[PDB]
Amino acid sequence: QGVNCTEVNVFQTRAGCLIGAEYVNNSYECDIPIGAGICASYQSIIAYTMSLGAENSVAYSNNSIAIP
């Protein structure tokens, strides 16, 4: 936490570098929170950006309605 490992699978984050876990570009649901926009999870252990949710862009119109 806050200790830069350049003067001590390496991924440098804002809180600190993570050793032993590889960074993945793809984003999934987090399991073990870490902080500073990153967290680790087990699937080997990997780290990825948080998945806020499924993207759903609703079509908006001033004359269209949706009735359940």
């Binding site: 809180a15 806020l52 949710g53 759903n56 609703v58 119109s61």
Partner: protein, 404 residues
């Protein structure tokens, strides 16, 4: 006879900066003998570490439950047209690389050893994205996204539903839609100028930050306290005094530091409980004021509540309460009932209104005089039971159908 659209701001804190306290090197430093003597004090540092981790995860849970209210991220449509209404102040600016609204950017700009500042799980970026998704859901789907799946609705339809929820008919919406849009834009600009020109509008978050900083500074300064010892430096006592007593001096210094740490932990726990209560209140306001229309008075702003726009704040949340304020009252004459052929007529949803000569019916929240007919009135009882009944006739819409 007139209405005013007013925008009010409510600031509620969410959490604080997460702090981790290392007992061993703060109380005794790098001295091995002091650490060995501290090992005979029990599990005080372990208990404090457990309490601090519990406070940190409590703050994380509060931040998750106040911001991540929906599991679906909604994106604004490419066309930013809502019948003349303006929302660029609350929508994120694509020009800014931070993906934050100008109101959010101004709000962020207006807010400024053994202790490690643990960063929060949710930083500014995904909190701003959550607020943008919630704004898109409440500007496109209304309150339906908070009630299950997203049900698209036009903005005038949502506004008409919201004013129908507070007992105002939708006829006045179509007659003065441009007036409503202009009043909303003027109120948004006025509240933006007011928040830009008022440094004291962020008093709660600034006070919380100042209290945390003062607590950290006080804990730092307690290391220089002698606590009745010969000196405040452990190494000076070790290299200048006999051990037989020097161990008593070390014990006195470490129990003074432990008492100061206990005071800090109690203060942090009290502050965390207060902030948890404030975050529960903020979550209730997010669930009620923003995700729907609340009929509660004074809960979501002054007067009748229409909607609330959430914005991202540093260690807090700011609600843009847009409300309905009646204005320009006019004197009028009432009547308990209308006596027609020995029958008493009462309004179904409005009240009898008179300007001095004729008698009409109008809503409680707006002056909309209509002809007194049998469709909007019901008959229950005769005229001698009520007190102060006036004499007037009731127009029958069915009568001209068979008159000719």
């Amino acid at each position: 006879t007139n209405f005013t659209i007013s925008v009010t701001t409510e600031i509620l804190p969410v959490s604080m900066t997460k702090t981790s306290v290392d007992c061993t090197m703060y109380i005794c430093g790098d001295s091995t003998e002091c650490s060995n003597l501290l090992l005979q004090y029990g599990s005080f540092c372990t208990q404090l570490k457990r309490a601090l981790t519990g406070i940190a995860v409590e703050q994380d849970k509060n931040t998750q439950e106040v911001f991540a209210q929906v599991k679906q991220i909604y994106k604004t449509p490419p066309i930013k047209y809502f019948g003349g209404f303006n929302f660029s102040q609350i929508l994120p600016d694509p020009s800014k690389p931070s993906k934050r609204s100008p109101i959010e950017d101004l709000l962020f700009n207006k807010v400024t050893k053994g202790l490690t500042v643990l960063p929060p799980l949710l930083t500014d970026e995904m909190i701003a994205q959550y607020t943008s998704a919630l704004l898109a859901g409440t500007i496109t789907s209304g309150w339906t996204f908070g009630a299950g799946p997203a049900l698209q609705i036009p903005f005038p339809m949502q506004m008409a539903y919201r004013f129908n929820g507070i007992g105002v008919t939708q006829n006045v919406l179509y007659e003065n839609q441009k007036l409503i849009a202009n009043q909303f834009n003027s109120a948004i600009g006025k509240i933006q100028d007011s928040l830009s020109s008022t440094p004291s509008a962020l008093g709660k978050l600034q006070d919380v930050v100042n209290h945390n900083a003062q607590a950290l500074n006080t804990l730092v300064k307690q290391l220089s306290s002698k606590f009745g010892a010969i000196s405040s430096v452990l190494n000076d006592i070790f290299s200048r005094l006999d051990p037989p007593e020097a161990e008593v001096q070390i014990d006195r210094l470490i129990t003074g530091r432990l008492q100061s740490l206990q005071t800090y932990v109690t203060q942090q726990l009290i502050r965390a409980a207060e902030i948890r209560a404030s975050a529960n209140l903020a979550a209730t306001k997010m669930s009620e004021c923003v995700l729907g229309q609340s009929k509660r008075v004074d809960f979501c702003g002054k007067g009748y509540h229409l909607m609330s726009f959430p914005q991202s704040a540093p260690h807090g949340v700011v609600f843009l309460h847009v409300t309905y304020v009646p204005a320009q009252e006019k004197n009028f004459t009432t009547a308990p009932a209308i006596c027609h052929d020995g029958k008493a007529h009462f309004p179904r949803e409005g009240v009898f209104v008179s300007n001095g000569t004729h008698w009409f019916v109008t809503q409680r929240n707006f002056y909309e005089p209509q002809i007194i007919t049998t469709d909007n009135t019901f008959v229950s009882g005769n005229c001698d039971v009520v007190i102060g009944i006036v004499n007037n006739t009731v127009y029958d819409p069915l009568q001209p159908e068979l008159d000719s």
